[PDB]
Design an enzyme around this catalytic site. Structure first.
Site, mmCIF file in Angstrom:
data_model
loop_
_atom_site.group_PDB
_atom_site.id
_atom_site.type_symbol
_atom_site.label_atom_id
_atom_site.label_comp_id
_atom_site.label_asym_id
_atom_site.label_seq_id
_atom_site.Cartn_x
_atom_site.Cartn_y
_atom_site.Cartn_z
ATOM 1 N N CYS B 27 0.770 -1.217 0.000
ATOM 2 C CA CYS B 27 0.000 0.000 0.000
ATOM 3 C C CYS B 27 0.808 1.277 0.000
ATOM 4 O O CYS B 27 0.422 2.297 -0.571
ATOM 5 C CB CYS B 27 -0.921 0.090 1.276
ATOM 6 S SG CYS B 27 -1.694 -1.532 1.597
ATOM 7 N N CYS B 30 1.713 3.799 -2.986
ATOM 8 C CA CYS B 30 0.785 4.854 -3.381
ATOM 9 C C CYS B 30 0.240 5.680 -2.219
ATOM 10 O O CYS B 30 -0.214 6.788 -2.504
ATOM 11 C CB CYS B 30 -0.442 4.238 -4.021
ATOM 12 S SG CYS B 30 -0.118 3.344 -5.578
ATOM 13 N N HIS B 31 0.221 5.117 -1.009
ATOM 14 C CA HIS B 31 -0.378 5.894 0.090
ATOM 15 C C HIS B 31 0.650 6.558 0.989
ATOM 16 O O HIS B 31 0.294 7.342 1.893
ATOM 17 C CB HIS B 31 -1.375 4.979 0.827
ATOM 18 C CG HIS B 31 -2.643 4.683 0.053
ATOM 19 N ND1 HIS B 31 -3.598 5.671 -0.090
ATOM 20 C CD2 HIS B 31 -3.135 3.597 -0.582
ATOM 21 C CE1 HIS B 31 -4.616 5.204 -0.787
ATOM 22 N NE2 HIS B 31 -4.392 3.948 -1.108
ATOM 23 N N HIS B 350 10.100 21.974 -14.698
ATOM 24 C CA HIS B 350 9.942 20.516 -14.717
ATOM 25 C C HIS B 350 10.328 20.054 -16.123
ATOM 26 O O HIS B 350 9.515 19.905 -17.031
ATOM 27 C CB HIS B 350 8.505 20.089 -14.396
ATOM 28 C CG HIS B 350 8.368 18.603 -14.289
ATOM 29 N ND1 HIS B 350 8.236 17.780 -15.375
ATOM 30 C CD2 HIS B 350 8.355 17.800 -13.197
ATOM 31 C CE1 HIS B 350 8.142 16.517 -14.972
ATOM 32 N NE2 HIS B 350 8.218 16.502 -13.635
HETATM 33 C C1 HEC Z 1 -1.686 2.519 -6.277
HETATM 34 C C2 HEC Z 1 -1.696 1.597 -7.303
HETATM 35 C C3 HEC Z 1 -2.505 2.066 -5.011
HETATM 36 C C4 HEC Z 1 -2.209 1.035 -4.227
HETATM 37 C C5 HEC Z 1 -1.081 -0.014 -4.386
HETATM 38 C C6 HEC Z 1 -3.179 1.028 -3.153
HETATM 39 N N1 HEC Z 1 -4.013 2.114 -3.308
HETATM 40 FE FE1 HEC Z 1 -5.538 2.662 -2.088
HETATM 41 N N2 HEC Z 1 -6.006 4.174 -3.309
HETATM 42 C C7 HEC Z 1 -5.330 4.539 -4.469
HETATM 43 C C8 HEC Z 1 -5.998 5.670 -5.071
HETATM 44 C C9 HEC Z 1 -5.543 6.337 -6.393
HETATM 45 C C10 HEC Z 1 -7.035 5.980 -4.287
HETATM 46 C C11 HEC Z 1 -8.089 7.108 -4.484
HETATM 47 C C12 HEC Z 1 -9.361 6.522 -5.112
HETATM 48 C C13 HEC Z 1 -10.387 7.508 -5.599
HETATM 49 O O1 HEC Z 1 -11.391 6.983 -6.121
HETATM 50 O O2 HEC Z 1 -10.173 8.733 -5.468
HETATM 51 C C14 HEC Z 1 -7.074 5.055 -3.193
HETATM 52 C C15 HEC Z 1 -7.991 5.036 -2.140
HETATM 53 C C16 HEC Z 1 -7.958 4.192 -1.044
HETATM 54 C C17 HEC Z 1 -8.880 4.196 0.082
HETATM 55 C C18 HEC Z 1 -10.058 5.177 0.195
HETATM 56 C C19 HEC Z 1 -9.762 6.588 0.702
HETATM 57 C C20 HEC Z 1 -10.905 7.561 0.557
HETATM 58 O O3 HEC Z 1 -11.888 7.171 -0.129
HETATM 59 O O4 HEC Z 1 -10.810 8.691 1.088
HETATM 60 C C21 HEC Z 1 -8.499 3.239 0.925
HETATM 61 C C22 HEC Z 1 -9.101 2.801 2.281
HETATM 62 C C23 HEC Z 1 -7.315 2.607 0.372
HETATM 63 N N3 HEC Z 1 -7.025 3.190 -0.843
HETATM 64 C C24 HEC Z 1 -6.638 1.557 0.958
HETATM 65 C C25 HEC Z 1 -5.587 0.868 0.380
HETATM 66 C C26 HEC Z 1 -4.934 -0.279 0.971
HETATM 67 C C27 HEC Z 1 -5.338 -0.846 2.357
HETATM 68 C C28 HEC Z 1 -4.005 -0.691 0.104
HETATM 69 C C29 HEC Z 1 -3.023 -1.898 0.333
HETATM 70 C C30 HEC Z 1 -3.572 -3.142 0.119
HETATM 71 C C31 HEC Z 1 -4.039 0.186 -1.042
HETATM 72 N N4 HEC Z 1 -5.015 1.147 -0.865
HETATM 73 C C32 HEC Z 1 -3.200 0.098 -2.130
HETATM 74 C C33 HEC Z 1 -4.225 3.894 -4.967
HETATM 75 C C34 HEC Z 1 -3.628 2.769 -4.446
#
Ligand code: HEC
Ligand code: DHE
Ligand code: DHE
Ligand code: HEC
Lengths: 526, 529
Positions: B27, B30-31, B350
């Site tokens: 995760c 990206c997070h 950039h």
């Molecule tokens: C990049 C490829 C990602 C990886 C790897 C993971 N996430 Fe992610 N997540 C990503 C994006 C671009 C977004 C935004 C989605 C949108 O529609 O705007 C998200 C969102 C989440 C959320 C929701 C947050 C919210 O709605 O405010 C959660 C809970 C989340 N992501 C969890 C999560 C977990 C637990 C991951 C590991 C397994 C994970 N993400 C990977 C992009 C990417």
């Protein structure tokens, strides 16, 4: 119920903390686990209690703890503040960057106002700069008359002295990272500049590449993990470098790699820095501090002390807990060998270089963990099969040895046994005749000099430590290190006859340890 | 604590540990390591408590078309892991872990040993004219024929795929993802695929190959955002050979900085060295790979906020943007030292690798556009024949609008192409500006430009297509642009005929999901830009 440990406002705590890292951590440790001073962690201090801590900080102790209150270094309120702080959990050790170094940087005499030639009558090259461990001072002693020329304050926790390549500037470093620069040309030599380079530190060195005389000084810290290059005339801090990084063998991040010995190359304009926990030897080029070139050499972990061979080309250093000698070629900037000495915990200091009658040029070291003396061949050109191999190992007085010494003009090899548990041994020195060595496998015999007995000192625990020669290589000095409230001395041995030459005694000669002859230190003669 | 009012449905220590491993491994690319968000949204407690358990569980289960994987429905995380993670995200953020040699080696896999690989190209592809295109939200790259425009292959690398780089001989394709995943692909196989892979950190962006004559295919290097380190790897197997920490002192205040990220990494053509930007300390490292045990490096004090950059036309000088300070830093890679630092007069330069060309009156120049304004800046790059212009900003003029990311040209062309990807107006963001280099004079009159309606040429209406990054074919006669639309929407690649500045071909395919970075094998392996 266990006594009540008082509050402490934020300001008070901040004040206490500044004092702790600035004035106590050099001996008690940045995490309070002790160094020369006892651990002061709260599992220990809460049991001692406030009154006991307050009393110790007020009066100090003859075993080396300063009398903060009775010396007026801390006020009565500050003393209570510190006793209260020690009952609390250890604070997070701070960083110590450029801002903090420059706040501590003081130039007492600017370079333009210092003499332009020697203004005293002393024989500067034969002077001995002696560390007075629990007095926070150094003694400048005349190498021929044996007179104490002067006693200079540097600061509590004073460790060792080093000289600039010209022999004019005396540099001293304390365990707190305090650096003092002393101008030996003044009428009355004193500190002309000072600076603090960390919380805990041990080494300092000067630029020794021909043509770079007096240009730079470098200091290494234990905390934070960094080394600093300073202007060689003003101590201005010019380049700070972190030593945090990866171990050489496992390649895992190590958050606290202490800098150990720092030497200076005679082949290139580089400093040679031992980084202990990661097992890295750094060759740092001071030609250009902004576009900084360095060679980071994977060596062995536990690097501590070491020295250059007789030709001044190769750096030989002990990786002490792994019982190895590491060899670096300073001309090519590369590791050349790693060898086990066969003994436990090699502790060479700068070591002892000599020409063995059958092996050729060799470098020797004694050990803390056993009585052995090991020799390594140091001549790839003339003795290729002996080069960087352990050629002989023989016993000296006993375990607990710290320093081995010789000089080009002497046929003898001297070995101390400072930490041996037996007073007869720790008060004596083993001497080997280099000209009688044969390398046929038989243990060379040694004469035992009764150094402490020669000084007339039995009371307390006199430990004999570190031979240091005079400029001519005719006499070798040994420290008879006794407690601060005990009688100490320096014993001068006639090298040619191996007979007592002179005993230096004085009320100001308190806990004398490291001794550095100006000429021998400035030219790396050992 | 769990029963308290403010209290959260605990995980035992072991459950927390399993969730924490999933977080950093899958995760955080990206997070973010502190959960502050990167490409994905911030997942800190302040925000996640208001989403609540059931939202998180559903978001992690189903994902979304903005790029968040559907962990639950793909089977990627079993039913219980989703819950673990949802529970985990309500808790306080863990301390980011280190990622050393043991962890790299655990992730290191050699699918095809070098002995077992082809000894000559075994497919009939035109490898040097191939384009490697990042399929952002698909976690894949597409290998596309540069002349027939057909997709030769679509290869899985991993979610968060970022960019591609080529070994000096053009045989090996290296791709790095934002999570520090590195894939090595052998282009000589009958069916090219990943022959080796490894992970170098939790967050990462750069990768590069040894380009010093004589060191072709010897090494690859990857730089990380977290932990703060770069790693040199064997060029044929990806074996991690040397990990170097970038933690250190800032160049100007000389204060310790605990997390100096690695930004762009380039390769010298003058010495056997890698060129590493260390963002927060403002240091550029010249790392000599001839001996990794007695490691020689040059640590150059530069300017903070170093990001991307490229080599000048002669390949001797590295020119890089210190973007938040609006400066260009110039390093001489032959002498190994800083030679200049100049303000572009624009906001947030950039350049990508930038655009080198011969200006009719100024001589050799390198150009950059800007994220924060519409300007294009030119710096003189010939100290030998044009010493009075060298390392000076010689001109600044407007292109389509702010939000530009990439500027491009080629030696065989007289045009300078500038995108405007992030401009708020779709009219600007779907177009590309083109200036005629031969008509430039340098008298202070803004060079005029032609506006190519790249998104309009693609024939797409849905979503919010954005045009990004020109990339030329090997012969320097056609320039490609990505029309980046959303994951569940139609995207395209548009090929422009350089000589006429007219549409040549529109590449569209069901498999072409969110195409962004495009790298021509020959122009990447040789640093032609
Ligand atoms: C990049 C490829 C990602 C990886 C790897 C993971 N996430 Fe992610 N997540 C990503 C994006 C671009 C977004 C935004 C989605 C949108 O529609 O705007 C998200 C969102 C989440 C959320 C929701 C947050 C919210 O709605 O405010 C959660 C809970 C989340 N992501 C969890 C999560 C977990 C637990 C991951 C590991 C397994 C994970 N993400 C990977 C992009 C990417
Ligand atoms: C890193 C280091 C050096 C090399 C300096 C350089 O290269 O400039 C060194 C050198 C030295 C040298 C250099 C001698 C030489 O000829 O070069 C001496 C005499 C010396 C006397 C002592 N050292 Fe020192 N010493 C330490 C570290 C070091 N000692 C410690 O970590 C240690 C073990 C514990 C401590 O808390 O400080 C320690 C205890 C001592 C002593 O107890 C000694 C015996 C007496 C004293 O003064 O405290 N150390
Ligand atoms: C350090 C770095 C490099 C240089 C790599 C090298 O030298 O090998 C780079 C290169 C690149 C290059 C190389 C172009 C070239 O011609 O060299 C491209 C096309 C690119 C497309 C994007 N980059 Fe990338 N990029 C980042 C960092 C970087 N991008 C980010 O920190 C940033 C701003 C945000 C993020 O979370 O990742 C980011 C967002 C993007 C995009 O949104 C882009 C436009 C599309 C995408 O795929 O996500 N980045
Ligand atoms: C080295 C020069 C020291 C400095 C600077 C400080 N202390 Fe110290 N302290 C030192 C030693 C060698 C010892 C042991 C003394 C002995 O007789 O064995 C001590 C002891 C203390 C104690 C007593 C701990 C105990 O008995 O268990 C305290 C409370 C203490 N030191 C505090 C202290 C403070 C607050 C300092 C900064 C002002 C400080 N010490 C400096 C050596 C050195």
């Amino acid at each position: 119920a266990p006594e009540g440990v008082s509050a402490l406002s934020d300001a008070q705590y901040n004040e206490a903390n500044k004092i702790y890292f600035e004035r106590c951590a050099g001996c008690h440790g940045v995490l309070r686990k002790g160094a020369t001073g006892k651990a002061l962690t709260p599992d220990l201090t809460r049991d001692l209690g406030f009154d006991y801590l307050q009393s110790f900080i007020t009066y100090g102790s003859p075993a080396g703890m300063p009398n903060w209150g009775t010396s007026g270094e801390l006020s009565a309120e500050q003393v209570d503040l510190m006793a209260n702080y020690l009952l609390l959990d250890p604070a997070a050790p701070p960083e110590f960057g450029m801002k903090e170094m420059r706040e501590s940087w003081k130039v007492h005499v600017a370079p333009e106002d210092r003499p332009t030639q020697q203004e005293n009558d002393w024989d500067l090259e034969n002077l001995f700069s002696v560390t007075l461990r629990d007095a926070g001072q150094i003694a400048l002693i005349d190498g021929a008359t044996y007179e104490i020329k002067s006693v200079l304050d540097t600061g509590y926790a004073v460790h060792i002295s080093r000289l600039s390549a010209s022999g004019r500037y005396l540099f001293v470093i304390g365990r707190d990272g305090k650096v003092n620069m002393i101008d030996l040309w003044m009428k009355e030599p004193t500190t002309v500049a000072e600076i603090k380079i960390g919380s805990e530190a041990r080494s300092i060195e000067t630029s020794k590449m021909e043509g770079w005389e007096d240009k730079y000084a470098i200091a290494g810290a234990y905390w934070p993990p960094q080394y600093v290059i300073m202007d060689g005339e003003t101590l201005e801090p010019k380049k700070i470098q972190s030593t945090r990084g990866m171990t050489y063998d496992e390649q895992e991040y190590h958050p606290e790699p202490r800098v150990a010995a720092i030497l200076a190359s005679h082949y290139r304009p580089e400093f040679i820095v031992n980084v202990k926990e990661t097992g890295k030897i750094l060759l740092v080029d001071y030609t250009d501090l902004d576009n900084l070139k360095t060679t980071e050499i994977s060596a062995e972990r536990f690097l501590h002390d070491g020295g250059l061979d007789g030709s001044h080309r190769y750096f030989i250093t002990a990786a002490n807990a792994r019982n190895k000698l590491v060899v670096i070629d300073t001309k090519e900037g590369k590791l050349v060998a790693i060898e086990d000495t066969g003994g436990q915990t090699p502790h060479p200091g700068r070591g002892a270089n000599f020409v063995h009658p059958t092996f050729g040029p060799v470098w020797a070291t004694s050990h803390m963990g056993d009585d052995s003396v090991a020799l390594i061949g140091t001549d790839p050109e003339g003795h290729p099969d002996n080069a960087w191999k352990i050629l002989d190992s023989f016993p000296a007085l006993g375990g607990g040895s710290l320093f081995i010494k010789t000089h080009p003009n002497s046929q003898y090899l001297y070995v101390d046994a400072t930490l041996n548990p037996e007073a007869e041994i720790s008060g004596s020195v083993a001497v080997f005749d280099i000209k009688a060595m044969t390398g046929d496998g038989s243990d060379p015999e040694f004469k035992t000099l009764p150094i402490a007995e020669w000084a007339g000192i039995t009371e307390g625990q006199p430990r004999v430590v570190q031979g240091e020669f005079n400029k001519d290589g005719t006499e070798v000095w040994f420290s008879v290190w006794n407690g601060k409230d005990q009688e100490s001395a320096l014993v001068v041995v006639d090298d040619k006859t191996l007979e007592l030459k002179h005993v230096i005694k004085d009320e100001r000669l308190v806990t004398p340890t490291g001794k550095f002859n100006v000429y021998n230190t400035m030219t790396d003669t050992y």
